[PDB]
Design a protein around this ligand. Structure first.
Ligand SMILES: [Mg+2]
Lengths: 465, 389
RNA sequence: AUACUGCACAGCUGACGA
DNA sequence: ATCGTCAGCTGTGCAGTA
């Protein structure tokens, strides 16, 4: 009755043929998987003069000597080695004096005095994009821009989403951007919260923001990937697809979003979105028999352009079930092209059953329980490496339901999905719950909803993360 | 500015070599790999016995796994192939300026495939006068699941369709009187666990025309809608099984304990064989240092759900709380109270709730069994972390 | 919006009847 | 046409990582 399994923690592959399970420690003693050819990554700043000055101060202070938080749990709050001789990225970050743009004080008051909600956001986005385009068209081009948001603009704009509208109009530029509030770069300043007024917000310490921001900046600037999931020995070649759904901007419709992922010929990884919008079909979170084929055709066409041959396995992940039609279209395309092995899995974070054990701390991360054809997987909980349970109440398990047309058993699928959790380049944490393809699909659909009709869509992942 | 700390480290290593006296010698500008060549003097009368020295010097910071007794270092597999082809011994020397620390290690030049990850422990690997002749020597537990199995009565009656609308019978005084099992679904047949001649037609508008009989096959049917109707039957049977003991919270779909003419708890809990019985199910609270101003209450509750699996009907229990004002009169607002109560909790303070709800739910009509148990191979460490959660 | 986890509310979908 | 039963998805906001 209810046979259970416990999986080991997967290991990521870093540079120089080194593998570990901690992204922080594996970077600090082996470097990135792909090394940058060159020493300098150039950073541009756009915002207020105070924000530019404390951004420069923050960069210098972080580069010099910053250190961790506490003596308890040494494997959970590591110190930052700094951008010196023993930097984890083996490269240097510099800011040029010509790639810095300042917003005049005689315009933020114009933004703040408008009694309309949409127009102020629109013109602030217009000003920021105008300065960025003027910087890009010149000869002082940076590799990654930092948009530091002042508190005066933040009060008017945050209190229509701003991040989505800004990243939708910054798609034509040649460099990605990174939004930073005034709290992170400069201390002694606190931002008041939303409708729950006079409570403000709290952030991490100095040594976690540094790790996350520096990893994101390196990935956005260099273009190379820091780490990747270690392949096993003897597996078949496979490609991963992830599908999500998202509502309209203001109305009540539902579009679908997709992301694709596979492995390079040498030592690399490929993670992209698409180059087109998937239109509308109503208000149900379900695809059709025509929109399910085209994603499979694009996924199979992307693999042959790199490996010169079709893959032997296709892996599809979704949140809203495979009743009869999407599965029919996927199977039809898959048996039409070349492929013998297939997998269709529906994940849901809505089940009510849990597992209760004696003691104080909850169950271990990676525990798997088989309920007939369904799998209860705990990709959250206590970890021996960290030394505690990083949470408050209890882990929320995932329920895995494979479709009735699938090859692998549910244990191998659970192991594969458990392996694809620490490949999030936005964060350096070890307690991720969702697998990478659906997270990428949600991140793509977060900003794909604020792009107007007939505009451009980029397949680069650096413009969505 | 790293050139100056490299030069300082090389000079300090040469000085440490010259203090005991071994005739160390540096190299030129385009040196790559070996940083120096050292001799063995042996207290005057020097002998031509050279070793190669590679220097790693630092200024501040900590090593990778500095645990006050040892740390570790990783090699780059280019220096390994470089050092494994030499015709003379190789030595790596670590120097730190902040605490003036010197350590040394020997690269194994005698095995087959190389081995990285040097484990440098202190005391025993100090580059001082203590270790010089050695330097010159080479020249399952268990758990339970939240589900609860159920077993049903062997007979149930499917006949005597009422031909009356489902609301009219309820608003008839027969409906809002004694036993309210007058359940018909989508104007369908009146099927229930008790015969209408003794249960319904005695106290509910119905027709005396038939006796009915079923082997509980209705429990399992391929159609989803009839399964949902059976779930509605099970929910109403559970509601009938607990008359004048608990009440129904519709906005949260929960069963909350009632203050039976007194606004304190009942403390039924679970016997637990040799153990005792305490459970503060109902509790009141005050604020502003005055007991007259009653703030809220803490009714226990659980959300039930009926599921079909392995041709069995399992009950899923979700513990929660209900807050009212004064007593048996619902609160106008509990937005932060439930979240604050949930925030301060543990996994230990959730298994006991399930156990006590199970022990209350059966014994003192449908029987409720015992929850299944599973065996876990790898146990949680749980040692030395007796705090927090 | 440096990040991840946990919780609380509102809205919208299909299947079943007056 | 609105109201009951069943199960499920996406959107927004706050607290705390220990
Ligand atoms: Mg990011």
């Amino acid at each position: 009755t209810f046979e259970t399994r416990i999986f080991d923690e997967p290991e990521l592959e870093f540079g120089d043929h080194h593998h570990h399970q901690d992204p922080r420690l594996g970077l600090s003693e082996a470097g990135p998987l792909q090394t940058f050819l060159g020493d300098v990554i150039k950073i541009g700043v756009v915002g207020n003069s105070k924000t530019i000055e404390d951004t420069r101060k923050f960069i210098e202070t972080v580069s010099s000597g910053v250190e961790g938080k506490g003596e308890k749990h040494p494997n959970m709050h590591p110190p930052f080695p700094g951008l010196g001789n023993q930097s984890p990225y083996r490269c240097r970050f510099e800011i040029e004096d010509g790639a810095t743009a300042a917003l005049t004080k005689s315009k933020l008051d114009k933004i703040g005095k408008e009694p309309d909600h949409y127009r102020a956001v629109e013109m602030a986005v217009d000003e920021i994009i105008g300065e960025l385009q003027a910087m890009d068209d010149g000869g002082s081009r940076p590799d990654v821009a930092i948009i530091a948001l002042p508190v005066k603009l933040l009060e008017r704009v945050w209190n229509p989403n701003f991040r989505g509208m800004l990243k939708a109009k910054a798609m034509g530029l040649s460099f990605p951007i990174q939004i930073v509030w005034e709290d992170v770069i400069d201390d002694k300043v606190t931002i008041p919260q939303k409708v729950k007024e006079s409570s403000s917000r709290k952030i991490q310490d100095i040594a976690g923001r540094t790790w996350n921001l520096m990893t994101s900046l390196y990935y956005k600037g260099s273009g190379r990937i820091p780490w990747r999931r270690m392949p096993l020995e003897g597996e078949f070649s496979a490609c991963y697809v992830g599908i999500s759904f998202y509502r309209e901007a203001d109305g009540q419709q539902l579009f679908t979003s997709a992301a694709q992922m596979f492995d390079e010929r040498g030592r690399g990884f490929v993670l992209k979105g698409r180059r087109a919008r998937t239109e509308s079909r109503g208000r149900h979170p379900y695809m059709a028999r025509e929109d399910a084929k085209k994603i499979i055709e694009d996924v199979l066409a992307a693999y042959k352009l790199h490996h010169k041959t079709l893959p032997a396995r296709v892996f599809i992940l979704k949140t809203s079930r495979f009743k009869d039609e999407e599965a029919d279209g996927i199977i039809a395309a898959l048996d039409e092209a070349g492929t013998e092995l297939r997998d269709l899995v529906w994940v849901q974070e809505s089940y009510t059953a849990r597992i209760l054990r004696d003691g104080n701390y909850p169950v271990l991360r990676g525990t798997f329980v088989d309920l007939h054809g369904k799998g209860l997987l705990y990709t959250s909980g206590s970890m021996p490496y960290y030394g505690t349970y990083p949470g408050k109440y209890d882990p929320n398990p995932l329920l895995l339901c494979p479709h009735h047309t699938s090859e692998s058993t549910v244990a191998q699928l659970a192991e594969e999905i458990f392996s694809l959790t620490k490949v999030n380049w936005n964060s350096t944490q070890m307690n991720q719950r969702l697998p990478i393809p659906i997270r990428a699909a949600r991140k793509v659909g977060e900003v794909l909803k604020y792009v107007g009709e007939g505009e451009v869509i980029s397949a680069d992942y650096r413009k969505y993360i | 500015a790293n050139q100056i700390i490299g030069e300082i480290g090389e000079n300090e290593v040469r000085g440490r070599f010259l203090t005991l006296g071994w005739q160390f010698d540096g190299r030129s500008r385009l040196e790559a790999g070996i940083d120096g060549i050292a001799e063995v003097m042996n207290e005057g009368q020097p002998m031509a016995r050279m070793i190669a020295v590679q220097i790693k010097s630092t200024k501040e910071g900590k090593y990778t796994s500095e645990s006050d007794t040892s740390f570790t270092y990783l090699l780059r597999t280019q220096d390994l192939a470089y050092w494994r082809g030499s015709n003379l011994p190789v030595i790596v020397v670590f120097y730190r300026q902040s605490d003036h620390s010197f350590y040394w290690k020997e690269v194994s030049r005698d095995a087959g495939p190389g081995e990285r990850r040097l484990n440098i422990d202190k005391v025993a690997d100090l580059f001082n006068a203590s270790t010089v002749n050695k330097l010159a020597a080479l020249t399952g537990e268990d758990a339970l699941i939240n589900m609860l199995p159920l077993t049903l009565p062997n007979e149930m009656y499917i006949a005597s369709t009422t031909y009356e609308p489902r609301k009219a019978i309820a608003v008839i005084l027969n409906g809002d009187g004694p036993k309210r099992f007058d359940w018909v679904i989508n104007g369908g047949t009146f099927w229930s666990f008790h015969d209408p001649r003794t249960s319904a037609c005695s106290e509910i508008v119905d027709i005396d025309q038939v006796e009915a009989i079923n082997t509980k096959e209705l429990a399992l049917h391929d159609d989803i809608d009839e399964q949902n109707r059976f779930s509605h039957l099970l929910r109403q049977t559970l509601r009938y099984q607990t008359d004048s003991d608990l009440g129904w919270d519709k906005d949260h779909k929960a069963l909350y304990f009632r203050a039976i003419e007194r606004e304190v708890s009942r403390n039924f809990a679970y016997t637990s064989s040799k153990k005792k019985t305490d459970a503060n199910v109902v509790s009141v609270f005050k604020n502003s240092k005055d007991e007259t101003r009653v703030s809220f209450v803490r009714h226990h509750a659980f959300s039930p759900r009926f599921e079909l699996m392995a041709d069995q009907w399992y009950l899923i229990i979700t513990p929660t709380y209900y807050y009212t004002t004064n007593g048996y009169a619902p609160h106008q607002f509990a937005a932060p109270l439930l979240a604050g109560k949930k925030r301060l909790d543990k996994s230990a303070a959730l298994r006991g709730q399930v156990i006590m709800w199970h022990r209350f739910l059966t014994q003192s009509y449908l029987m409720f069994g015992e929850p299944p148990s599973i065996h876990l191979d790898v146990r949680v460490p749980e040692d030395g972390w007796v705090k927090e959660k």
